[PDB]
Amino acid sequence: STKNGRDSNPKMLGVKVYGGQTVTAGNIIVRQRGTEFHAGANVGMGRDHTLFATADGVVKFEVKGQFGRRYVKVET
Amino acid sequence: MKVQASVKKICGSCKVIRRNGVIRVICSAEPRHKQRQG
Amino acid sequence: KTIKVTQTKSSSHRLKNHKLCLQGLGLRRIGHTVEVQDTPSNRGMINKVYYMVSVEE
Amino acid sequence: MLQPKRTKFRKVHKGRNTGLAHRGSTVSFGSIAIKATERGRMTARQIEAARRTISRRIKRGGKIFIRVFPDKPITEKPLEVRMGNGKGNVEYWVCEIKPGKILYEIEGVNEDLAREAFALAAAKLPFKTTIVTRTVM
Amino acid sequence: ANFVLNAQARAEDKQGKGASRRLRRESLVPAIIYGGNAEPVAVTLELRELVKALESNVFFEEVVEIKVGDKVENVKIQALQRHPAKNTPMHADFKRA
Amino acid sequence: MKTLSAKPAEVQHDWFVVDATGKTLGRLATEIARRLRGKHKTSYTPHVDTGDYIIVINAEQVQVTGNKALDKKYYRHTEFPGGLKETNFEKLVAHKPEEIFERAVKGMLPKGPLGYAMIKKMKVYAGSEHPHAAQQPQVLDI
RNA sequence: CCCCGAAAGCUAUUUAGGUAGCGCCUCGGACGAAUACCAUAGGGGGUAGAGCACUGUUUCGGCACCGAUGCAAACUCCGAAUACCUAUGAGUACUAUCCGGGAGACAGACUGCGGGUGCUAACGUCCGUAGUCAAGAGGAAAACAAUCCAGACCGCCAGCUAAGGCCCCAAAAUCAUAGUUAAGUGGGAAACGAUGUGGGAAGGCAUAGACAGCUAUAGUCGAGUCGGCCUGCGCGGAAGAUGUAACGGG
């Protein structure tokens, strides 16, 4: 008899809106367990590290800063 | 006569010959070196 | 400015996008020949199914 | 019987053996070496047998470098057991061999004796081999 | 002077994976020549000539001459690629000297 | 109904004689089977026999290539248990030359009543003489 | 008689050969480019490969460190091709979407590719992805659901082709030009063994005379000879039970 045989339910993480798409305020952009992407301009962060848009515009990804962090922002 | 898959010269008096599509070894000195591939 | 495409093999067992490329060029059966505009958009469909069409350029 | 002192995991997936050996295909430690020409598996007992043959033939007059280590465990079912009910038990350890991999190197002997020892050793291995010597590049 | 290799130009339609495989099937060897003040030059060499040259030891430390028709280059061997299992040379690099 | 079949009452069979000295067995047999079946006539009909009569002389002088004289085997089975009989070409040609030609041509003719009727038109003789002078055969060189 | 045409999946179930919701079929209504194929533009990745910068593991030296050297589904300093999302656009096509009536189905199979398990066993078992069968006839593979070619409205004693073929059974070349094989290899099988033959790149000795044989290195003779490497096609290794029976036959 094996001592294995368990696993957890899926969580459906990942990027929901890619670069170049238009969003409205409140749209969820990234679902993530940790902070792989950071919040840029017009982007807010939830209590579970979810990134969402706070204004209408176009999504844009970039790499910025002295630590080389990945940022996502919304251009109005 | 030795019958084996591998046949080789043993001493300087062994000769490798071919008869009717069969490879044989015949020795001038000692009869016990006689071989036939098979 | 226009090119002629002829279907030379069957399309029954091919991939779905290959069948759709044939339908988007307008070929309907073996031996059918059509005349289409010479544009990159048409050339892409032709190049995807190169192995079962013949082009009179 | 070479085998790792400890391992992070006990059982590993089968995998597939593909490709060539671009790494580990150059004579580095000695002057003459034997290398594989086709792919396969090499067991610890085979490694030990070939090493014993080479050492016995050359009479420990030089130094032998072994460049293969069996870090992969292989399992088997206890026999008369049906399918299912978990993975088997570790029985032996192997090394995966790709074409071009060097198995043994010899330092400090004459080429005739090294070649005769390598010919003695090659009869114990389950794949074809060949002899190479060091070169500038 | 002492070491001379006859070569022919290797063009863009002769560069690539399939082209190189066809060249080696025809028993030829691709080579590249780079060095100070000039752009790289791609050439093709004879397998037998390359093997004969590599057999000698002075080839790796002496200036060699590569002749493509009228164009002549003086170079040193820099890098060599061999097949992992058959030891056949597969590609050569030459640094201008 | 514009394509017509040959009528058996209107078929003419002609007599030819062939000498087998120095000929290859199978390459002679194919031509013999062709002319027995009637494939050389413009009135050929699949269900009608239209072929010719072929007399074969010097039957023991036929040849085979390679080592087939000693290595080609002929089998038969008496239907009793263990009753497989075996011979080879060089003994069979000395003993019964006509059965070699019978086997070779029978293997190339159709298997049925029409084939049985067709093979009746081949006459094989070991020597250089045949008893069919009354039919006035013509020399055929195939 | 005419038209269209599935599924053997997901989730739950005292549920597992039953059933229910969703997915897949059909009919009616609304509404037309909002749809798809392809091109161009924008975008995130951590797989194949690779590597040792972390975590482990490995060999040999020097003094845990230093120099070389390997390995990894649960290692990563790196990192594709494809797939996937969005926008614009030519051409082709009854496409997409919404609201209602009626269902069936929830036992799948094989083949290729990427894998777990098993012995890199099984016409084995469990997933992902595509094709065929299921529900599909015709030609080829001797016969042969699942392979190759190809999608049958009806009739014709007309023509051109696909896969596969052109000596006879049995339709079409005993066709043409160069080579190889002697094993009926073709038309079953390995490590290994061998002056079998064809081709290629080098090397050693040699008409102040080379190899073999012979006379006690010299000597009679009169041109090649010697030993390896790469490669094409062959040989042995090769033993079973009713009947040749491992080209369909000749």
Ligand SMILES: [Zn+2]
């Ligand atoms: Zn002897």
